[PDB]
Amino acid sequence: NFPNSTNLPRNPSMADYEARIFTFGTWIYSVNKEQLARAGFYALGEGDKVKCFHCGGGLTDWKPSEDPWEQHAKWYPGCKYLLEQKGQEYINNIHLTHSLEECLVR
Numbered sequence: 464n465f466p467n468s469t470n471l472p473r474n475p476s477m478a479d480y481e482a483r484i485f486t487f488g489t490w491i492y493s494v495n496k497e498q499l500a501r502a503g504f505y506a507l508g509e510g511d512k513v514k515c516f517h518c519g520g521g522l523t524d525w526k527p528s529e530d531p532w533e534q535h536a537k538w539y540p541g542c543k544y545l546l547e548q549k550g551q552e553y554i555n556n557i558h559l560t561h562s563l564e565e566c567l568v569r
């Protein structure tokens with residue numbers, strides 16, 4: 464499934480922060496659930512699989528050093544939720560950061 468880059472959320476049932484939060488339940492994983500919800504993510508109930516309510520972009524295997532908004536920008540750069548909450552300056556920063564990384568680690 465392709466990522467939603469329209470201004471309309473793919474899962475409007477999950478558009479409220481309240482809604483997203485309930486999906487987690489007791490959360491054992493290394494990334495903060497409220498942080499994840501704030502970044503538009505709700506839990507799938509399979510390991511630490513989250514999905515963004517707006518773009519539908521899915522992310523998994525959360526390391527403690529990984530930020531929700533950073534990972535959102537990384538994999539779902541076309542998400543209009545992301546664009547709106549963070550701004551384009553932030554998204555460019557994130558991209559330049561990750562690309563410069565993949566060329567210093569590399």
Ligand SMILES: C[C@@H]1CN(CC(=O)N2CCCC2)CC[NH2+]1
Nearest residue numbers: 521522523524525526529534538
């Ligand atoms: C949270 C972070 C996400 N990474 C990539 C991922 O989960 N993807 C699934 C769809 C394509 C990118 C793995 C490491 N942990």
Ligand SMILES: [Zn+2]
Nearest residue numbers: 515517518542
């Ligand atoms: Zn998104």
